[PDB]
Specification:
The structure is a homodimer of 133-residue chains.
Chain A: H1 2-18, H2 23-28, H3 34-46, E1 50-52, E2 58-60, H4 62-85, H5 89-100, H6 105-119, H7 125-128
Antiparallel strand pairs in A: 1-2
Helix pairs in contact in A: 1-4, 4-5, 4-6
Organism (chains A, B): Bacillus subtilis (strain 168)
Binding site for Mn(2+) 1 (chains A, B): 6, 97, 100-101
Subcellular location (chains A, B): Cytoplasm
Chain lengths: 133, 133
């Protein structure tokens, strides 16, 4: 479920930078009260995505690492994509959040080629960054 | 509302090709039973988007033409965009439906430049259509 996914994403990201994931970290990295976080976080534990250990933060399982890595990849790519085409830095997150669960892997794949296409030649970020006239 | 919007889109499109918009046309161009269509179609009439005249199809107002033209433009563009980057023809509609209500006008605008960028040189649809290796 998209609810569960946002959390897996946020947990994986917190892990990748920090090592662990506190509860408060989730609470404010989603903007939802820690009251709700607690309910979901023990739910996701019961479903074998994570393991909630108080004082000790939050650890993904093999099943959490599988999904987290996936979710974060497309998220980062869609974010990378919007940056390339030239969208405001401050509008990227909100837009990617709202489209990431509504795109087929084929489209995710094609966008990948599109990002690869501009990255392969930074002397082509040029032409794009001139049509804004 | 996104519900109302899908209908405005579908009505505008039917008008643009046909002249009018029958009820059955809506019923099967959304896949939702004509029972629901009827309820919504008289609702949208009450809200001054259209005018429902039996036997005589469905006519947008100035307020319907304003929104319809807008909705269809981004829809067509997002559809155009997915085609350019190389997505399966059969996956385009479903994907555009699910992302069109979740993208900012800034992103819609930037994608516009992106489409303009490839259209301006069909000798650049080339490189893209070779990274699929």
């Amino acid at each position: 479920t998209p609810s569960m996914e946002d959390y897996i994403e946020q947990i994986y990201m917190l892990i990748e930078e920090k090592g662990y994931a506190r509860v408060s970290d989730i609470a404010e990295a989603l903007a939802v009260h820690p009251s709700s976080v607690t309910k979901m976080v023990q739910k996701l534990d019961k479903d074998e995505y994570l393991i909630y250990e108080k004082y000790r933060g939050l650890v993904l399982t093999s099943k959490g690492k599988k999904i987290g890595k996936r979710l974060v990849y497309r998220h980062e790519l869609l974010e990378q994509f919007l940056r390339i085409i030239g969208v405001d830095e401050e509008k990227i997150y909100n837009d990617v959040e709202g489209i990431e669960h509504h795109l087929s892997w084929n489209s995710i794949d094609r966008i990948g080629d599109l990002v690869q296409y501009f990255e392969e030649d930074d002397a082509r970020k040029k032409d794009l960054k001139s049509i804004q006239k």
